[PDB]
Symmetry: D2
Subunit: 325 residues, 4 copies
């Protein structure tokens, strides 16, 4: 009795095409339909009773929070059904970490939710998408995969949505969680589970988004030498509810950034200090403005802050979410 798996397609390079097999840059993402992906790796049909559903077909640099919200709602609907055992979501690599972390916080099920992506288009020589998709279906259909939070499967690895990130612009092995590792790996058609994330997610999460149609506006500002105050002013003037700061080092702030953050706080904007570095802990520091992002990178911090702002604007409550989610 095969597991029943929905393959929910959103686009991405995994569905991308170019004229020739040697073109691995500058191709069209989000060009092929979900059934074409399935039928390119028909071994998936040995692992599961699969059903393709075309949710969207875009390059992931164009994925937007209002669309991710709809995606989360659709996945929750699917997983409430007795005839669905898990869902695989085909997505672009550029922003999978954002979409996956959003669903990690908002899907109220222990059934597997497995994002899958590809760094080479479907037409490329040695395209990675076929094996990635096979692995993702294997993970989604395995009873041992339940209760693990949302996963991102690619290049034989299983990453937690909370930790995994695209670390390299262009390589197949780009998805890594340097300090936290992988939840598991898939080698020789077998899953090896290594870790369970020690954070709240899915069925233990407070972030209910049923019925919503919009999310709080959050922008991300970079930290660097000579960083300007005017970008703070511009964000404030355009109505942001939060600013995530991709800070120098451990969320450190220049005199110009401090002035911009104090203006934001005066206007009721929540300021969250993360890091541009790529990894590690931004620790509390009562001498600096704003909250701190724990080990969340800027992209992830923005997603959690948007969701936090659906429930509260209390900085103490938001800070505790950042230490527990």
């Amino acid at each position: 009795k095969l597991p029943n798996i929905v393959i929910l397609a959103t686009g991405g390079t995994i569905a991308g095409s170019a004229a020739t097999g040697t073109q691995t840059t500058g191709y069209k993402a989000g060009a092929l339909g979900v059934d074409t992906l399935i039928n390119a790796v028909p071994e998936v049909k040995k692992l599961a009773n699969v059903k393709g559903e075309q949710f969207s077909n875009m390059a992931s640099e164009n994925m937007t929070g209002d669309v991710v919200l709809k995606l989360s709602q659709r996945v929750n609907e699917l997983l409430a059904r007795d005839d669905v055992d898990g869902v695989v979501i085909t997505h672009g690599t550029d922003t999978v970490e954002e979409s996956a972390y959003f669903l990690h916080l908002t899907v109220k099920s222990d059934k597997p939710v497995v994002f899958v992506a590809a760094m080479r288009p479907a037409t490329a020589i040695s395209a990675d998408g076929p094996m990635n998709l096979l692995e993702a279906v294997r993970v989604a259909g395995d009873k041992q995969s339940r209760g693990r939070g949302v996963m991102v499967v690619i290049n034989d690895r299983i990453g937690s949505a909370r930790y995994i990130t695209k670390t390299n612009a262009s390589t197949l092995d780009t998805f890594r969680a340097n300090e936290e590792g992988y939840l598991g790996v898939i080698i020789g058609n077998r899953i090896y589970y290594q870790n369970r994330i020690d954070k709240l997610h899915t069925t233990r999460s407070v972030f209910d988004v049923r019925g919503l149609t919009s999310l709080p506006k959050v922008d991300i500002l970079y930290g660097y030498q000579d960083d300007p105050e005017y970008l703070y002013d511009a964000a404030i003037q355009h109505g942001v509810k939060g600013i995530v700061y991709a800070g120098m080092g451990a969320g450190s702030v220049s005199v110009r950034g401090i002035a911009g953050m104090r203006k934001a706080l005066e206007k009721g904007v929540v300021v969250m200090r993360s890091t541009r570095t790529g990894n590690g802990i931004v620790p509390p520091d009562e001498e600096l403005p704003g909250l701190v992002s724990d080990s969340l990178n800027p992209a992830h911090a923005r997603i959690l802050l948007m969701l936090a702002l659906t429930r509260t604007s209390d900085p103490k409550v938001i800070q505790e979410y950042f230490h527990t989610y």
Copy 2:
């Protein structure tokens, strides 16, 4: 006879002094004088005849291009002297990669220039700065260190300014070049040189800023889901000469970012597409606006773009610099 090494101090956590040995976060960077750093490691007198000079005493999140330019000019003056064999620059960790890469491009000497920094303040239990400084003096004084480009020495490693970056907010081992490795290591009081960088630098660089007192203004804008067009408008309106884009994946651009970039281009602003990921190549793509950053991360790309704009506004010339520096 021993080498003659100038220790040119700019501040940083290496010169920071907290109230207790356990405080490693929330201390004051840039408090101790250069001679106090030297006198904490009097072993240095066995490696070199050292002289301290106090250039500045600031936390590196406050280092600015106008000041970095002065630092480069002062180092050029020092290295023009026959009685100086190399220079060690004590600096904060947060923006050492920016200052070091600027000097890498503008120092007109083959004599060693070694930036050194610390992740723990000088007061801390197991502070790293004492050993880092001893290692940096050993590197700067070794004849085999000549002609290597500017170096960053910390935690037993020798990094090229072009590749090294602070990858972790808070750990001792934060400086890494994941794809390019270290130029060398220092183990057991001995230097092991591994690589020479295959890029132009120092005495083979066209960038000369000895007749300047400031650099062209360049800002950095992040890429993420829902990234706003208005931050492009704000940069344009505040007189930027260049914009570096810390892009999704391989410099990929949303419909909003493309509209922003096209406005910038129409105003004569140079747009340079880098990556937020942390590593790897942004490849050319004629269907997208702007130039591409090769393997330069956003912080490094901004430094090179500022220097490029002192010489040309021809995008073909600038693009070639980004492939060769």
Copy 3:
């Protein structure tokens, strides 16, 4: 109020003294007593009521299974007391992964057991041992630390005994688990727990060795081009019960190694195929002789095989241990 923590000292570089602060590669491991370690970082007394006990004082390349057996027995006796909340074990770095994984399998308590070590001797400039010890006491005394399996704390990281390994001969940051990450990190005097290991250990382990005064003999043989049959013959002749093979790639075997493994199997030895590579899965392959090590590296595989052989010689039972511990 404060937790009661026993510091059980075995030796190591953390207890080493050299003649100068620059000696980092020629000093003596296992020279200072436990109260000298404690009184050198007296800040531990603010985290715990600490009591030092001198178990041994040796360099860890000389640690032996018979002594590890006694260490495990003593830790079990300490943790059986109601007045002991946790134990920190000071140990050498070279074989901490072996001792720690043994206790991970044999300690019948959920109270924390934290191994700590140092890469520089106690006399070194920027010695790492003081901070590592302070961190280890913090981890051992935190209620959140219970039930995590045995831990190795060093360089601000908390590694599981099952995954952590010494990856570099000589650096402070040598302990890593590349594919599995860290259980947690210690930054700014705060613990950040990231993962729980998804394997059996401690109170859920079958490997009780209380009462033993000896262990099964298990040797490790390397795989390489031209590897010889005669080392298998020698091991058999000297009474091994098991051989761990540090194999080429995924436990792959030359014609000579296969001949040696077949002789061992003929002579009643259990053969376990691991990998020399450093990481990853050795998958089943029924066209090759012997068992497979899953993601256990050679040093860890030897420990598990030795303990397995106190309970069984059944290959199916042993193979399932390797997939679950």
Copy 4:
């Protein structure tokens, strides 16, 4: 007008075949002929005028020094011809680091020598070998690739034979040089050169192995708790000329290992202390027996020690080879 490249085939998983696309473990390495590999990627004919030559067809765990000698001799012959611009050598992954380093030391040419391999067989879903082979031909035919030492090309990366190693049993991204990085990368059909290795190789090497048909015998012994003296005795009795020790930590030796090494030294065996850890420097230590391996891992140390012994048994000369090659 195109470069002339010989594809010299030796076997490996790149030439492997299985009965289904999902079998990625347990397959037959060295099953397919070189022209089958070429014909799978006729795109190569746009990069180069290629000619296949079948040297051998074996799994690389079975590659032996006598055969590597013949490989080096053949490559030297090919590169002496005006009508050969470079050579691509198809090889198994398990021991490519050994064969490649041997040729790095013995091929007296600046023309590119590029080893290529695959982690999945040619029949696998998302097999890596087609793109790896195209990339290797691109590298071998580019003028910019001359004088770089022997290279290993796989997974978009260009590794030096002296630094690259198989770090994972089973993943596509297994070849890494953690401390030294890659010489270059291949992205979007373009080569990005990053580093030149700062070591002696190829045209500057003293290791002349013309007329030789065999090499001095060198075995590798592991270091671990309870390591036995009798394996040294066995190696001595079997006539080894060298022993490479894959030591605990920084080549550290137990009381038993010391006794074994002193027996070996008394019989005129050269003892070379490397590390089992995976990375880094084994520093000199006059209180321990034998020589030290610098940053060479055990597999590379054995290759260099064998070749060293074709010139001398003087331990000070051999030590200097280990610091310079």
